[PDB]
Amino acid sequence: RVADMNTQVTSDESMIETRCVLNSHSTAETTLDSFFSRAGLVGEIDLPLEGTTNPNGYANWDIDITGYAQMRRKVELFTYMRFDAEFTFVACTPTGQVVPQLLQYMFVPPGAPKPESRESLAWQTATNPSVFVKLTDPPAQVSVPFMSPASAYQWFYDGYPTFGEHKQEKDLEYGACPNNMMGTFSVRTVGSSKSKYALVVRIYMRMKHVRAWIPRPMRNQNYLFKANPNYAGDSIKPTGTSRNAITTL
Amino acid sequence: TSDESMIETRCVLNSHSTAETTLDSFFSRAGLVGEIDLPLEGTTNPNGYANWDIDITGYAQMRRKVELFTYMRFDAEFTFVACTPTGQVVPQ
Amino acid sequence: VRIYMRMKHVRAWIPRPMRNQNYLFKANPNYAGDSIKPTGTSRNAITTL
Amino acid sequence: LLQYMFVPPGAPKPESRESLAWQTATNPSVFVKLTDPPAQVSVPFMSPA
Amino acid sequence: SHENSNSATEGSTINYTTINYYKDSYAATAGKQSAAPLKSPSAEACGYSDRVAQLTIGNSTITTQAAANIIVGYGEWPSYCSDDDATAVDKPTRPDVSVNRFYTLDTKLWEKSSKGWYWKFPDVLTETGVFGQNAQFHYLYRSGFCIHVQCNASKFHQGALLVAILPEYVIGTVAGGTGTEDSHPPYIQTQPGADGFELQHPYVLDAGIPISQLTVCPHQWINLRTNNCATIIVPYMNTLPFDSALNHCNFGLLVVPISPLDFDQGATPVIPITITLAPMCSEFAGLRQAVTQ
Amino acid sequence: SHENSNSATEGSTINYTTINYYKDSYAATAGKQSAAPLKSPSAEACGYSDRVAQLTIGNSTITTQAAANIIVGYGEWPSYCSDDDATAVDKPTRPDVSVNRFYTLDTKLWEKSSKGWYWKFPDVLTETGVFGQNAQFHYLYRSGFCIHVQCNASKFHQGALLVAILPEYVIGTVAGGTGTEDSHPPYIQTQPGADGFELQHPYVLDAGIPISQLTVCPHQWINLRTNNCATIIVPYMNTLPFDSALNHCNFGLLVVPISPLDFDQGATPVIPITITLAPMCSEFAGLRQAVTQ
Amino acid sequence: GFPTELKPGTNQFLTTDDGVSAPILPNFHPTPCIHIPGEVRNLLELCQVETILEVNNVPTNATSLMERLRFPVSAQAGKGELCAVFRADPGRDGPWQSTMLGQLCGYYTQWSGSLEVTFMFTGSFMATGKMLIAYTPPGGPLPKDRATAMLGTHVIWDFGLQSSVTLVIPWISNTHYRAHARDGVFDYYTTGLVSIWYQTNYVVPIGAPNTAYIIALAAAQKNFTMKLCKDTSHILQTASIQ
Amino acid sequence: GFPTELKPGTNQFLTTDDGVSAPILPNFHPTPCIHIPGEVRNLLELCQVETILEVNNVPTNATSLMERLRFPVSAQAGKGELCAVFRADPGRDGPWQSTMLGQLCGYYTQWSGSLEVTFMFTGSFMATGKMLIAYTPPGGPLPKDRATAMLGTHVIWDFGLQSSVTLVIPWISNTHYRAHARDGVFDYYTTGLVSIWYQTNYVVPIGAPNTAYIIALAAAQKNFTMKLCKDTSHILQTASIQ
Amino acid sequence: GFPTELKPGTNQFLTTDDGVSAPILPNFHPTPCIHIPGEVRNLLELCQV
Amino acid sequence: ATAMLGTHVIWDFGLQSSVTLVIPWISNTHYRAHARDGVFDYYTTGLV
């Protein structure tokens, strides 16, 4: 009772005279599954003998692929980005030597206990996905699914995770979407005593079944901090090279 | 009470899989159930042999996982990661 | 020698309360009686968080 | 352990051993030990001609 | 056809798609899997209102509110062991009227500072009745149980009891308090008989498991403003078709006050909790001389 | 049938031929894949001339040239959340005439030396209107937007504005200039409200991304010799069906002069840019007390 | 010799890898499975069982640890007083750790779906009164009064007549799944706050106790689902098992 | 034990190898994909979007960096003056680096197809005039006059009437694909030079500004295609990310 | 783990071995082959000149 | 900002030299008496 509830004989045609061109040019190499399914360095883990970085033989690497400029700029072409990842860990000595050392990679999802020591009880990995591999073995390759609570990963989060007043002490929470932090990637030398080899674990990550949504401008400034679009303000460089004059090349 | 007798609800298409909460998903993850020490000078197993009684209640994580139930029938995938106490992979 | 064990074709029957006390001995539900801790964290008051 | 890396024209040639071009996020690269058999890769016909 | 059907999920009702390169099914992958019993279903929820209309088991009758507030343990009525489940070749005796009847154990007093008690089954019925004689005389025992915990209090009394059935209720100790003693509970604590045993630490149930999470097990409430009794029909659960009734307790009946008993001065201070249990579908096999334990 | 359908491309419209030796589809290879939305399509190009013939949203009407020079963001009209996309079980409120209407924010003045401004959405509409009250009162928010940037100038004035919609416009800082400070932008910079915020470095958009490449995002031009207004109909984009309207800005509206404003002396020096935005298909869920932020 | 290339990942031991291993016992057929009652086939069945919620997680000593399972209700001044508050996050470190929903949530990173919190009145039959149990969706802080609280999802509970009401915490979130809310950045995944207010009072005659107790039982609905299994952190041991 | 020979290439890690790896999470189903607008399914879709071309890439300081996005046009002496020149190579280090076509071309070795360069006039409505935008095919150097330039592919642009013309740079090359032209041997792959000349003048009355600006927007056509994905070199970092 | 025995000849590199190697460039389609006159398809054609 | 919360139109007078603002019939009563400065301001249409 309411009723209100391939060139042929701007497509090259309107500008010049054209011949017929049979364009047998495949577009399959410009897809996301072609542009992004290439493993790039997203993490390097140092396990030295005398250094103060990870002196106890264990390390907790927070999963943040924005630590290296190449893959960060590749994935940051978009905001929303849903994919499965092929994670490869190339463990080696800092001199490149392949030493007979056994390591334990362990995926520690958010909420799972980060190991506080090399001999921590979190290394029993009764539920956590963990990889046991020697350095003499080929690099450990694992298929990582799309694990975000969101429908896509989000390299740019214009907002704050929590409510309440956002002071300068809580300003670091800006842009930190917890749909993207997926816990830590924990590495140890499997043993009670300290490993006799300095070790470097290089994480190489290849994304498969890639879906990306919203293209943004690329990164024309030097990256400074992970998960942060901060740029050197006093040294802003142009997007490309310059010219002495505009009438010349 | 199915959200209907408490609030007004919209229609939600719940394409939420329950396959990850099964026993074959919650329990088919290898956990540390035993560590065997074969040292050179220690008094634990100094003769190069050890007899580890099969008892998976020695480590809190998997023990609490399996002790959610009393009766529990399964086949087990047992993996033995042998290494030096310094983590070295020795030709032994 | 570290033994890692993964159970397949799992069938389990009778759910009990989980373990909210620290394990002390294998195949034994013994708990530290003089240091019984609650199942979770505590609060200074019930009207606050 | 060595890192072979195919650097197509336009891609940055690494200026050092610890260069950032070795992250090989788009470049085809091979990680292989010398104890491993020789690294074999199938290279297509890549010429613009 | 080329592999042995010898995995741990053979005979189950779920088809598991798997990968196997070996002769044995248990070598295969975990694979895929191609009201609610755990929520303490009632007799109305279990569809067993015909067997609960008036609870008369043997020569014993309990008068209580039926169907709605009467709990069938794990959605399973007690039943005699089938031929497939049973392994013992001798035919068991099924007295069914001399042993399947309500036995009244004791009358433990509920106080304002009371902690709670547990009864181990069928250790409670080991040394009384024809059920006790059959349990002592036979090696093998199998029965369900109909536990009817009774606690009457006036309408001016308050308090609630968690009447719960904890299967395989293994008793732990304080381990000397410091946790470095490896003590074990005595025989009178593990199998306390008909008079039961008071809980020293009801929060951990003297077993390191929280009292809060006890309601996954078949449980009932004796909230005094609503009900004065708790009927839990309990099936036989074991990894075995039969078991010894003298050195294995299938379950332990926890009766602890979650809400403390309270009343004003003048009301009767003696509030007793009476435990009544009827074995259901009792089965005794392996007859020999009678043994107390 | 033998593998879980749990890759990141399940539910998509493209069949991927792949190789998988495992139980999970996400373990498989990348495989093969067996007007334009990104080119800022117009209403004529989107086939939505019926909804743009006269732009009256709510009790508000904007008079502007329609269809040809009116841009639908990403080729997608705003729409209510479907049952498949939505996860919140409570039914959201859809006021649709009190919250879906053109709100006029402010009248920022365009100068010859002006750098440009950005407005974060729906932070601009957080504390005004029934839309503001619904955003403050409800946890969950979902709406499209019809941004109508207006800048009138005479035929002797010159200059062009890049009116663009930048989704998830995360603001960066100068990092102390030297790039070694790890500074973060303040709350008044990240969420500047209705009055907006002037760009300090419009070349990098205060985010390290070039202004030149902003036109992949839904954009418009206010080249003063041709048009004095820019209508961008913007859908709701998020990884989520709904989101908080107080601590997440779905997009940022960039209005910067690519071509500087210039005019001879005698013409009016006050050239204001007026921002008008109409929420489209607004959806508010998760009602509680009102919170400013 | 069939030609074969070994990819990255050979000789690695992924603990969650589902593979085919060599059987130790050839032609070993196991003991036949007798029928055991109560079989669990999914952890969401356990999550759907009501389990005592430790809203009153104030006491710490073992003497008063039983007081954690219930929280007091008593006669007030009739000014809409606050009885008890708790966060509605099952995986958060707090009141929900006593729940099987909380313990099972500790083993999974992401959860989604509505939650059943049954409040049962354990006073006398002569104890009458009403309580406003309000669930605040995220964003709203702890309400200062009952008027602030009733603007959210709430139920009104006559405990004089119905001794046990259930407050359904509806699934209201931006994300499709919720990670476990923590005191920090991950408070983005908060479910909100559940607060119990005196709607009228706790009314008793002479002879009835002046203070009663409410036992909160917490569970999850049929739409509940946990995801991304992980090691639990509700309980941690710094010592080995002897 | 099936007989098997390991070929060369075992235990190698090819970063671009498409293989099957062990899943870390068994039976993990991901969060369902809600519909998000604007989905990209090919980088050539991004390459077809008009993006501001930095023809006037003369200024360097941050104060005048916004002047790079547009180049001046003003009244001349009427002698066929030169307005602006730039190379037509999207992947070359120069004016095209500001373009998404240039940035995406930096990630691919070979490109083919025609290019759209839209020149939009941002002067007054009273500003009239014509420009000859000439694209010189490879081989012809920078034209000395407009007569030299009009022999190539050119358009004549009334900016008095039509405020934005597009100069289609047609795909004219010996090779089927073009690698990125550089100052050296790889200038073989040059697209040529695009030069803008004053066809008549920039004519304004009194009251209109004497200098206007043209915003060049560059893109690629439907026939465009990139090949042989490679690491980009348009931007390089000599420092790590903190 | 499919049971498998490695025969003699694993990890060897026979230079004339015709095998399948990992492609460096996924989904790389080459430049289409235009018709070039005089194509040789057998060295005996050269031997007959 | 206070005014745009009501029924409003936005009028480009540079292009369209004449817009019409429709004052919609929004009242409690079915008919409006003539609003006056006093009790009869109950029948006000509002302010434009």
Ligand SMILES: CCCCCCCCCCCCC/C=C/[C@H](O)[C@H](N)CO
């Ligand atoms: C056994 C090892 C398993 C390794 C699991 C790795 C999880 C993969 C998640 C990748 C998704 C993005 C992670 C974080 C994104 C970004 O770095 C920032 N958070 C956004 O700027």
Ligand SMILES: CCCCCCCCCCCCC/C=C/[C@H](O)[C@H](N)CO
């Ligand atoms: C070649 C190695 C074969 C390894 C065979 C291992 C047998 C697996 C049996 C696991 C079943 C449980 C074992 C013991 C259970 C518990 O730890 C306690 N007994 C009960 O608290």
